[PDB]
Amino acid sequence: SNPSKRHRDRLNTELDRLASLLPFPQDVINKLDKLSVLRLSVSYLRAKSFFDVSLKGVQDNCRTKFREGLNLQEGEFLLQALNGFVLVVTTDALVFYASSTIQDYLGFQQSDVIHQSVYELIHTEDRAEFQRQLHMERCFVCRLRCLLDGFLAMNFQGRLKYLHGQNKKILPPQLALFAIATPLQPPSILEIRTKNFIFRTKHKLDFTPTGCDAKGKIVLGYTEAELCMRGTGYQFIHAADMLYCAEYHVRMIKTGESGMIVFRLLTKDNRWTWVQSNARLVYKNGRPDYIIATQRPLTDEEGKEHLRKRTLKLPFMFATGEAVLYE
Amino acid sequence: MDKERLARENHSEIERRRRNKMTAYITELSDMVPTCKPDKLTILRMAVSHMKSLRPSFLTDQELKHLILEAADGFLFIVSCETGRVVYVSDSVTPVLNQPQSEWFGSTLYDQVHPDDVDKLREQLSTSRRSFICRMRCEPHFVVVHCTGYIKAWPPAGVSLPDDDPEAGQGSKFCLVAIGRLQPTEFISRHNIEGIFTFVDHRCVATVGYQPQELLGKNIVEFCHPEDQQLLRDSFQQVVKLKGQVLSVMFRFRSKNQEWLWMRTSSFTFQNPYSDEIEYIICTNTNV
DNA sequence: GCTTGTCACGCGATGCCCGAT
DNA sequence: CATCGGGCATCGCGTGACAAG
Numbered sequence: 001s002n003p004s005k006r007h008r009d010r011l012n013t014e015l016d017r018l019a020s021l022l023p024f025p026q027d028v029i030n031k032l033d034k035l036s037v038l039r040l041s042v043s044y045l046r047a048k049s050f051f052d053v054s055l056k057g058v059q060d061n062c063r064t065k066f067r068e069g070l071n072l073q074e075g076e077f078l079l080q081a082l083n084g085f086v087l088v089v090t091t092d093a094l095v096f097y098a099s100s101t102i103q104d105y106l107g108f109q110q111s112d113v114i115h116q117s118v119y120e121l122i123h124t125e126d127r128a129e130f131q132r133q134l135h136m137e138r139c140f141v142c143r144l145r146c147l148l149d150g151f152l153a154m155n156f157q158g159r160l161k162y163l164h165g166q167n168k169k170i171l172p173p174q175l176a177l178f179a180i181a182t183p184l185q186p187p188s189i190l191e192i193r194t195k196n197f198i199f200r201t202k203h204k205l206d207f208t209p210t211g212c213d214a215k216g217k218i219v220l221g222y223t224e225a226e227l228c229m230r231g232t233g234y235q236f237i238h239a240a241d242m243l244y245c246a247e248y249h250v251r252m253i254k255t256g257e258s259g260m261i262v263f264r265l266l267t268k269d270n271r272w273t274w275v276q277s278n279a280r281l282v283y284k285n286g287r288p289d290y291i292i293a294t295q296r297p298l299t300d301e302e303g304k305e306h307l308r309k310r311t312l313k314l315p316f317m318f319a320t321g322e323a324v325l326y327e
Numbered sequence: 328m329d330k331e332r333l334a335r336e337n338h339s340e341i342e343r344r345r346r347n348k349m350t351a352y353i354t355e356l357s358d359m360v361p362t363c364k365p366d367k368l369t370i371l372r373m374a375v376s377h378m379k380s381l382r383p384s385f386l387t388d389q390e391l392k393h394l395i396l397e398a399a400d401g402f403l404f405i406v407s408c409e410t411g412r413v414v415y416v417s418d419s420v421t422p423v424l425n426q427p428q429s430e431w432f433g434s435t436l437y438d439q440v441h442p443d444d445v446d447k448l449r450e451q452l453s454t455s456r457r458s459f460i461c462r463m464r465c466e467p468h469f470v471v472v473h474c475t476g477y478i479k480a481w482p483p484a485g486v487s488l489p490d491d492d493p494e495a496g497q498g499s500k501f502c503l504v505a506i507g508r509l510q511p512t513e514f515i516s517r518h519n520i521e522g523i524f525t526f527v528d529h530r531c532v533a534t535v536g537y538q539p540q541e542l543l544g545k546n547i548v549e550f551c552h553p554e555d556q557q558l559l560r561d562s563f564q565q566v567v568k569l570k571g572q573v574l575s576v577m578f579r580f581r582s583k584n585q586e587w588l589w590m591r592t593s594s595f596t597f598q599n600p601y602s603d604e605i606e607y608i609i610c611t612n613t614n615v
Numbered sequence: 616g617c618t619t620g621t622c623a624c625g626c627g628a629t630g631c632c633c634g635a636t
Numbered sequence: 637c638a639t640c641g642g643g644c645a646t647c648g649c650g651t652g653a654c655a656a657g
């Protein structure tokens with residue numbers, strides 16, 4: 001023995017007893033290091049002290065046992081319905097709290113994030129922006145590091161509320177950001193990534209659809225009947241492509257073949273999907289009967305590339321927007 | 328510049344920072360425990376004291392719910408994908424919709440929304456993530472609610488379903504678990520020959536303040552001043568009689584600020600190149 | 616085969632406690 | 637009522653062992 005080692009042993013004993021009480025699974029406590037043991041002890045105490053003053057049930061008129069069981073999980077239900085995670089950040093840009101689902105969206109462990117600097121999770125070029133939001137309602141966007149790539153852009157919707165019970169020095173409480181971070185919606189676009197996905201549609205002479213194969217149902221999202229009850233195919237065309245499609249329809253009327261055209265179709269989700277199509281005229285007794293269009297879905301990248309290298313220059317060429325379709 | 332010394336010095340300063348971090352965390356503990364100048368072992372023993380008193384998850388379910396609701400409001404609801412039958416609704420439905428927990432139970436999500444939306448509701452309930460915008464009721468009065476949720480296999484794990492429970496005979500296979508929360512330019516558009524917005528340019532936001540989803544489905548006359556409504560209507564009726572010809576009309580469009588904006592609309596018809604029938608009416612709407 | 620970080624250890628400079636002045 | 641020297645406990649520092657990555 002010797003006094004220094006005695007004191008270190010007592011310190012480590014107190015540290016282990018602190019680790020034993022942390023509200024984490026045992027496999028998480030075992031991997032912890034003493035510094036983060038102290039860190040999350042402090043963070044748990046701060047959280048409990050805030051909840052001691054800010055916090056505090058089915059209507060007894062409508063209370064069943066199953067409803068009680070669901071009420072005992074209401075919190076996790078909300079957390080799962082968030083489609084994202086919770087963030088509570090102090091004025092020092094310290095993470096007062098982050099929900100577990102942050103690991104679902106960024107790859108960071110909740111116990112590694114709590115009581116740490118928020119900027120370590122946020123892209124440099126955006127950190128300044130975040131600061132301006134920290135100093136009542138708030139709605140903005142930020143790029144956070146995603147270990148599952150590497151960054152992810154996310155919408156933060158939250159508020160600035162006083163983080164009570166922090167016992168700073170006694171100083172008054174400071175404004176903390178209570179926000180929900182959710183991923184960014186990709187633009188209203190549909191890009192089939194399944195390779196080799198050419199599909200054919202059948203139409204009458206005015207381009208009103210009458211038949212379609214399985215891959216067409218998969219990409220466009222309509223049932224076979226649903227395709228043919230909503231007017232001609234021009235009811236399905238993006239307004240930036242209507243005139244090009246009309247020109248190529250005239251070309252097919254005059255020569256039987258349309259040539260390769262690139263344009264956007266309206267899915268049943270009311271999204272736009274790019275297609276490179278080719279319309280051929282089928283004949284009955286030497287007279288035109290119906291149209292056989294064969295389409296290959298494109299990505300947004302090469303779609304905008306084809307649009308930017310457009311042969312004809314027609315009005316509404318660069319227009320963007322949304323549409324609906326009725327029967 | 329002598330690697331062995333650079334490594335030594337940076338390592339020394341690294342655990343110097345480590346020691347400082349440990350001391351700062353101990354000081355925070357001293358600040359956050361009850362009874363408390365004491366030394367490190369005193370503070371650690373009193374921290375064990377307090378933590379044994381206070382005590383798996385970092386937060387309780389109610390603490391997590393409190394954090395989420397403080398963050399961005401909302402009320403949780405759980406409905407069956409089959410009939411829309413409301414399995415569960417939180418008490419948050421009272422501060423959100425001004426409705427008792429009681430009007431939603433024993434009811435159906437279709438009965439709580441606007442009729443013009445029930446179809447879309449079926450859209451969102453048939454057959455993971457879901458996100459939509461509807462109008463729920465609070466003469467009756469409705470309100471726009473943004474709903475974000477997911478499809479979950481029913482019944483949920485952990486929750487016991489007794490025999491005499493009312494949920495015991497339902498037997499729904501899937502559920503929707505969601506949160507509901509209350510929330511000089513020009514642009515082009517395509518309408519049917521009645522005036523209903525069927526295509527809206529995004530620039531409408533910079534032009535009249537509305538988002539495209541707020542215009543699509545609505546007739547343009549709904550946004551026109553009552554004294555200019557017949558004029559705009561006859562403009563639409565005349566542009567159909569004169570195929571290809573352009574007709575301009577000036578009227579007052581009510582922006583979403585409920586402000587009247589003078590707008591010039593140029594309309595013409597798109598003809599099917601085979602049948603010469605009208606597909607829609609193209610309008611360019613410009614501020615004045 | 617190198618980097619960063621955790622943990623123990625030795626080692627003195629001060630702290631605390633307390634008979635003994 | 638202090639002040640004063642023991643002996644052990646706290647406490648901060650630098651370094652070496654060891655491992656995850």
Ligand SMILES: O=Cc1c2[nH]c3ccccc3c2cc2[nH]c3ccccc3c12
Nearest residue numbers: 207233234236245248249258277279293
């Ligand atoms: O109505 C134009 C159209 C078209 N409308 C549709 C509606 C539903 C599904 C597919 C289509 C479709 C495919 C097309 N392929 C074309 C080549 C040249 C010119 C026009 C078209 C055209």
